[PDB]
Design a protein around this ligand. Structure first.
Ligand code: EIC
Ligand code: EIC
Ligand code: NAG
Ligand code: NAG
Lengths: 50, 50
């Protein structure tokens, strides 16, 4: 909350307000870089080049 | 996918991932130009000047 801010942050399968009350089993992080018009394509059930 | 890119693309009545497996009956295309704050108004169940 002091330094880093996100333009989009959307989660599926769990509400955000409960993220501090849980514990997570098999955590993986995928990283890449896209353009601005492709950020909407990183979602379930989407079409496009990405 | 080579030349033209869309900032918003949202469809209603059919999932996007099935658009290559179907055939369409009565296809019409409406064209116009708006400002940036009015693109959100082109949707079902919306209010505003547009
Ligand atoms: C101009 C005539 C078009 C006729 C189309 C007929 C039926 C609709 C089916 C597919 C059109 C979807 C276009 C979306 C292009 C991909 C968007 C993206 O880059 O993610
Ligand atoms: C300042 C006092 C407002 C009191 C309003 C009372 C009830 C709410 C009902 C209508 C307010 C909706 C305002 C939206 C303006 C249109 C937005 C647009 O341009 O699309
Ligand atoms: C938050 O960031 C500022 C900027 O450097 C820093 O001075 C401050 O100590 C930070 N706060 C904490 C709790 O680290
Ligand atoms: C895609 O666009 C580039 C830019 O002009 C062009 O060189 C290339 O041949 C195009 N690809 C196809 C398959 O048309």
């Amino acid at each position: 909350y002091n330094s880093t801010f996100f333009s989009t942050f959307k989660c599926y399968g769990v509400s955000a307000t409960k993220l501090n009350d849980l514990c997570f089993s098999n955590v993986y992080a995928d990283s890449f870089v896209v353009k601005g018009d492709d950020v909407r394509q990183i979602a379930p059930g989407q079409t496009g080049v990405i």
